Amino acid sequence: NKCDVVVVGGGISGMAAAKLLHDSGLNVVVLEARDRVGGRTYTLRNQKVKYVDLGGSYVGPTQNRILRLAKELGLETYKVNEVERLIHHVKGKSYPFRGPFPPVWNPITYLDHNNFWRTMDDMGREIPSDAPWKAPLAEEWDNMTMKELLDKLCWTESAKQLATLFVNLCVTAETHEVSALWFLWYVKQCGGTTRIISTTNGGQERKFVGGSGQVSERIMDLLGDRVKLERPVIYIDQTRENVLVETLNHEMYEAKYVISAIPPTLGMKIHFNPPLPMMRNQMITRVPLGSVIKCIVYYKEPFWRKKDYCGTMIIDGEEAPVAYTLDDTKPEGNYAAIMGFILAHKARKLARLTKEERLKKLCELYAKVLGSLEALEPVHYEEKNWCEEQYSGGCYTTYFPPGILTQYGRVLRQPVDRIYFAGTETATHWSGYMEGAVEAGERAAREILHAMGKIPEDEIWQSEPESVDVPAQPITTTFLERHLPSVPGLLRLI
Amino acid sequence: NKCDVVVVGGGISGMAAAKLLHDSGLNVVVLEARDRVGGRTYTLRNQKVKYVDLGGSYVGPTQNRILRLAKELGLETYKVNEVERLIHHVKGKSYPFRGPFPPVWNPITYLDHNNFWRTMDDMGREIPSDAPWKAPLAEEWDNMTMKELLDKLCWTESAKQLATLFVNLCVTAETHEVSALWFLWYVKQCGGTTRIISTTNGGQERKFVGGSGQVSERIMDLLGDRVKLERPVIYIDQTRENVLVETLNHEMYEAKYVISAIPPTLGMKIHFNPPLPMMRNQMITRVPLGSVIKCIVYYKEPFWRKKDYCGTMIIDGEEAPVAYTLDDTKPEGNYAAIMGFILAHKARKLARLTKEERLKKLCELYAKVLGSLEALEPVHYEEKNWCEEQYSGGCYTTYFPPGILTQYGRVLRQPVDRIYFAGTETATHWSGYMEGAVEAGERAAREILHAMGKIPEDEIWQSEPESVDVPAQPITTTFLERHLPSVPGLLRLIGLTTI
Numbered sequence: 001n002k003c004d005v006v007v008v009g010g011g012i013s014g015m016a017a018a019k020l021l022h023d024s025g026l027n028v029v030v031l032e033a034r035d036r037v038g039g040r041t042y043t044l045r046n047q048k049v050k051y052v053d054l055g056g057s058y059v060g061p062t063q064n065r066i067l068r069l070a071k072e073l074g075l076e077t078y079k080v081n082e083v084e085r086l087i088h089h090v091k092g093k094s095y096p097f098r099g100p101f102p103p104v105w106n107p108i109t110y111l112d113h114n115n116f117w118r119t120m121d122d123m124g125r126e127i128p129s130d131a132p133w134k135a136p137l138a139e140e141w142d143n144m145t146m147k148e149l150l151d152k153l154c155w156t157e158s159a160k161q162l163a164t165l166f167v168n169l170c171v172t173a174e175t176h177e178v179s180a181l182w183f184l185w186y187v188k189q190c191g192g193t194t195r196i197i198s199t200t201n202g203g204q205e206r207k208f209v210g211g212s213g214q215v216s217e218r219i220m221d222l223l224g225d226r227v228k229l230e231r232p233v234i235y236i237d238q239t240r241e242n243v244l245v246e247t248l249n250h251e252m253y254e255a256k257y258v259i260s261a262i263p264p265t266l267g268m269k270i271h272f273n274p275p276l277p278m279m280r281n282q283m284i285t286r287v288p289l290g291s292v293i294k295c296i297v298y299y300k301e302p303f304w305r306k307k308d309y310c311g312t313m314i315i316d317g318e319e320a321p322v323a324y325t326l327d328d329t330k331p332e333g334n335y336a337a338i339m340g341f342i343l344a345h346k347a348r349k350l351a352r353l354t355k356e357e358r359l360k361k362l363c364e365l366y367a368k369v370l371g372s373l374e375a376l377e378p379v380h381y382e383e384k385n386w387c388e389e390q391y392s393g394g395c396y397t398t399y400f401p402p403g404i405l406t407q408y409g410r411v412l413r414q415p416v417d418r419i420y421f422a423g424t425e426t427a428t429h430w431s432g433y434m435e436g437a438v439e440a441g442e443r444a445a446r447e448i449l450h451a452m453g454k455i456p457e458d459e460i461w462q463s464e465p466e467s468v469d470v471p472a473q474p475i476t477t478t479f480l481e482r483h484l485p486s487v488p489g490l491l492r493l494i
Numbered sequence: 495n496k497c498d499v500v501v502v503g504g505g506i507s508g509m510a511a512a513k514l515l516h517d518s519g520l521n522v523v524v525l526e527a528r529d530r531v532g533g534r535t536y537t538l539r540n541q542k543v544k545y546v547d548l549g550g551s552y553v554g555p556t557q558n559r560i561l562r563l564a565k566e567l568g569l570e571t572y573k574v575n576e577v578e579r580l581i582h583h584v585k586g587k588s589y590p591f592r593g594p595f596p597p598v599w600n601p602i603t604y605l606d607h608n609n610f611w612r613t614m615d616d617m618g619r620e621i622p623s624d625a626p627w628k629a630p631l632a633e634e635w636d637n638m639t640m641k642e643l644l645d646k647l648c649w650t651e652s653a654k655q656l657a658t659l660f661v662n663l664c665v666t667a668e669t670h671e672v673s674a675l676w677f678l679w680y681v682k683q684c685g686g687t688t689r690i691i692s693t694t695n696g697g698q699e700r701k702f703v704g705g706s707g708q709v710s711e712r713i714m715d716l717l718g719d720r721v722k723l724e725r726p727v728i729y730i731d732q733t734r735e736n737v738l739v740e741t742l743n744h745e746m747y748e749a750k751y752v753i754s755a756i757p758p759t760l761g762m763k764i765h766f767n768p769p770l771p772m773m774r775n776q777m778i779t780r781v782p783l784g785s786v787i788k789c790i791v792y793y794k795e796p797f798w799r800k801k802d803y804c805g806t807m808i809i810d811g812e813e814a815p816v817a818y819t820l821d822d823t824k825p826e827g828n829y830a831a832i833m834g835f836i837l838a839h840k841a842r843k844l845a846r847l848t849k850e851e852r853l854k855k856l857c858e859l860y861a862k863v864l865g866s867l868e869a870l871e872p873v874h875y876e877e878k879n880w881c882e883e884q885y886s887g888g889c890y891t892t893y894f895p896p897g898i899l900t901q902y903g904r905v906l907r908q909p910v911d912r913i914y915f916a917g918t919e920t921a922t923h924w925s926g927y928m929e930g931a932v933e934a935g936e937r938a939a940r941e942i943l944h945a946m947g948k949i950p951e952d953e954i955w956q957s958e959p960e961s962v963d964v965p966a967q968p969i970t971t972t973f974l975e976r977h978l979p980s981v982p983g984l985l986r987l988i989g990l991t992t993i
């Protein structure tokens with residue numbers, strides 16, 4: 001019945017907020033729609049796989065908040081395999097390489113590729129992390145899709161294809177679906193192109209031993225009976241002295257404040273009294289989540305390593321069901337596996353098939369790319385289509401279509417009376433990730449602490465000390481990378 | 495408790511569906527979230543205005559379903575005033591004209607303008623009304639915003655400006671927000687550019703005497719206690735023999751079938767068991783409604799008529815709060831009024847101001863455009879911002895951003911077990927309008943009748959006889975309009991003679 005704060009949503013953001021408030025001495029309740037915690041993270045356990053992450057999984061350098069929270073909960077990380085060569089598969093052919101970027105040999109194509117990545121970071125430097133709508137050219141860039149930007153920037157089809165794959169993989173949406181301003185903000189707030197795409201020294205460096213689902217599970221252990229499972233919130237009433245929160249199974253909760261720790265659009269599932277202010281009312285109908293199926297194919301042995309392949313594949317073309325893979329073998333070297341993402345329109349297209357039909361397509365692709373008949377003999381298969389989830393709406397995160405970020409963006413984390421907004425979408429650093437979920441939950445919890453007169457205003461936003469276990473190398477450029485001309489630049493010099 | 499069909503939503507679509515089913519002999523219940531029926535139609539009544547439509551209002555030739563329904567209910571129409579001259583206000587200057595289109599004098603600009611409108615209709619002919627995703631170039635056009643299409647087509651700023659205003663007015667959204675394929679479908683399914691923009695012989699020809707809100711009100715009168723007000727639906731359960739429908743105030747309703755007669759995205763407010771199929775689950779997060787404030791300024795007399803202006807203004811420019819007006823005077827000639835729309839980004843921008851501040855801005859604009867000091871002395875003002883409505887989401891209707899219609903469009907009116915889908919967004923003719931609401935509601939009702947084995951399959955979609963009261967002139971083009979070249983076409987003809 002009665003408490004200090006109701007937290008709506010038991011994913012990482014909601015759990016991190018609840019933990020902070022509980023540690024501060026307040027009475028908290030977490031209302032969770034599902035029969036489990038974790039939300040967009042989900043660790044499946046069975047004898048065949050031991051454990052596998054079917055949602056959010058990877059962590060890396062500069063993600064100091066998730067690393068600190070996980071460590072405090074007794075969790076450890078291990079390194080994703082990147083010892084051997086990566087593969088770039090293009091026009092039906094495999095090209096092995098080392099380092100973060102697939103090499104380019106044609107001098108014109110080289111100039112075009114270099115300029116694209118450089119320009120993305122160049123543009124990003126003009127976009128404030130905490131206010132992308134304040135970029136000098138905000139409106140111009142927001143009224144443009146990424147597809148339009150790519151058409152303007154890329155003078156070769158080779159650069160445009162890779163850039164397109166990059167967009168699809170980053171935000172699980174088509175280039176024509178997303179705002180240019182929003183996408184450039186998204187990459188920038190993760191630390192730039194190199195940081196976001198890299199395994200070693202980047203976002204895909206590490207996973208948690210035992211799965212990321214343990215973060216939410218272990219906080220639930222700490223909170224005990226304060227977490228209420230199968231309690232979808234349907235109604236929030238702010239007309240009286242105390243806030244009233246009603247669930248689908250007819251329970252009523254009373255609190256001084258509420259944290260909404262759900263994806264922005266999922267706010268539509270709640271009936272508000274009084275009605276939301278105009279801007280938020282419309283915003284929450286304008287912000288969809290992407291489309292993805294996460295697939296893991298298991299093998300007797302990590303056979304690709306014997307051919308000096310690490311298991312990373314970058315696979316171009318419409319025919320390929322999966323555009324990107326990583327080695328998903330356990331740190332001990334057993335439960336050999338390849339993880340792949342089926343992205344955007346392909347997720348929608350291939351969802352019509354059966355599980356067995358999808359397994360076959362993936363194995364035939366991997367056999368081709370790795371040049372190995374062993375890829376055709378899987379021992380097990382696990383997959384998850386996030387598009388079908390009523391209480392997620394998709395994965396990995398919310399994207400903004402053209403025009404939306406400049407018009408509605410400032411309302412994302414603006415409080416509505418006694419409701420405060422968490423969730424990874426409201427973060428300013430690694431928004432879209434588990435790291436962003438921790439930032440947003442803890443920040444929202446502190447906003448309430450300030451509202452109660454318990455902490456000063458300057459303590460709402462808190463910096464995080466660097467992890468000693470996962471240190472960050474700085475991102476470097478070469479002299480030639482900085483000063484080599486673009487294709488139109490070279491033509492101008494001619 | 496128990497009935498044959500639960501209808502969710504008491505707007506025109508839901509009421510038309512309920513009436514059809516009730517007339518067929520079935521037990522129906524309508525569950526309506528608000529304390530009133532009508533939805534996106536709302537007629538306000540007070541002594542100062544007598545009556546005024548604050549939502550949906552205009553009807554015209556080819557909208558035969560709404561006209562027939564209204565006539566059966568005892569309603570009558572009258573003609574919107576278009577006796578005197580229209581005004582095109584551009585670059586701070588007013589240019590009076592006659593006919594549907596503002597004239598263009600510059601020969602290059604003339605070619606550009608002619609080609610734009612022609613091309614819109616040309617492209618539309620390739621788009622099936624009942625399946626726009628089947629257009630031969632569906633993907634190409636869907637992966638493009640209207641802004642991109644305009645940039646490619648319009649060789650003069652003059653044509654691009656007017657085309658932009660046209661998009662804003664049609665669908666209450668910016669050119670960069672909407673898919674080109676969707677917008678071209680939208681215009682085509684209303685009968686084309688001329689039909690959609692015209693007063694005389696078009697969509698804005700007429701209004702209902704006493705207001706359009708009477709359509710829903712009078713059906714409620716016929717249904718009696720079957721309409722339940724202040725019953726927002728929160729939960730639909732389809733796991734058992736009968737469908738269970740739960741409301742916010744904890745009432746339970748049991749039925750054989752459900753019609754969902756709400757805007758597609760408002761389906762998000764309902765929790766489903768079992769969960770919706772994947773495609774619909776994602777679709778309903780991808781389909782927002784537009785942004786608009788409808789404003790009516792009242793005067794002692796229709797003074798614009800004395801200057802030979804009918805009251806129609808097409809107003810270009812960023813500074814102008816209102817881009818389009820019509821005479822809203824009563825047919826008797828009293829309660830003189832100008833109706834104007836504040837569109838898209840301007841609706842969001844000017845909502846921050848007070849009512850008094852907005853009134854002032856409109857009057858100063860009208861004084862400028864009409865060249866009349868009298869515009870500065872209003873006697874009354876009414877307005878409605880539709881962006882603030884929890885149970886509408888916006889107005890006039892749902893738009894589709896780039897990429898959505900080809901990927902999710904086929905799921906719009908696909909039944910989910912025993913739930914069938916009405917609402918103007920699922921119509922194939924005048925979708926977005928009151929006409930489309932009638933078509934969709936009656937079609938959804940007949941889908942259920944077929945499911946019950948009461949009618950054959952070929953009776954689900956029913957054609958409508960033309961109104962005798964509101965006849966439709968055909969849309970004509972001149973010889974020159976059809977065969978005059980575009981700007982790039984003329985340049986090509988110059989490149990060949992000089993070779």
Ligand SMILES: *[C]C1=C([C])[C]=C2C(=[C]1)N([C][C]([O])[C]([O])[C]([O])[C]OP([O])(=O)OP([O])(=O)O[C][C]1O[C](N3[C]=NC4=C3N=[C]N=C4[N])[C]([O])[C]1[O])C1=NC(=O)[N]C(=O)C1=N2/[C]=[C]/[C][N][C]1[C][C]C2=C1[C]=[C][C]=[C]2
Pocket residue numbers: 008009010011012013014031032033034037038039040041054055056057058059169170171196197198204231232233234261262263266269270292294324386391392394395396397422423424425432433434435437
């Ligand atoms: C899905 C996914 C996948 C598949 C993958 C991934 C992901 C995902 N990610 C993301 C994450 O996960 C996120 O961010 C998080 O998790 C979020 O959190 P939050 O904020 O908390 O949210 P959520 O979870 O959702 O929660 C919520 C909750 O709530 C609830 N509800 C609802 N509604 C309601 C409720 N309750 C009550 N009532 C009501 N009404 C629900 O149920 C829930 O629970 C990620 N992340 C990270 O970090 N990592 C990773 O890994 C991930 N993943 C991904 C990634 C990818 N990557 C890739 C590779 C290569 C590359 C890339 C990118 C870029 C570049 C390169």
Ligand SMILES: *[C]C1=C([C])[C]=C2C(=[C]1)N([C][C]([O])[C]([O])[C]([O])[C]OP([O])(=O)OP([O])(=O)O[C][C]1O[C](N3[C]=NC4=C3N=[C]N=C4[N])[C]([O])[C]1[O])C1=NC(=O)[N]C(=O)C1=N2/[C]=[C]/[C][N][C]1[C][C]C2=C1[C]=[C][C]=[C]2
Pocket residue numbers: 502503504505506507508525526527528531532533534535548549550551552553663664665690691692698725726727728755756757760763764786788818880885886888889890891916917918919926927928929931
């Ligand atoms: C808003 C508006 C305005 C301002 C204006 C206009 C309009 C609108 N429009 C449109 C109409 O109105 C529509 O379409 C209709 O109405 C629709 O119907 P429906 O489908 O039925 O839907 P609604 O109404 O929305 O209903 C629904 C219902 O449901 C309910 N709910 C929700 N949720 C829920 C519920 N219940 C239970 N539960 C739950 N959960 C609600 O409440 C409701 O009731 C129009 N239309 C026509 O026809 N006409 C007109 O006039 C109109 N308007 C407009 C127009 C404009 N125009 C312009 C001028 C010039 C030009 C233009 C365009 C183009 C060209 C030129």
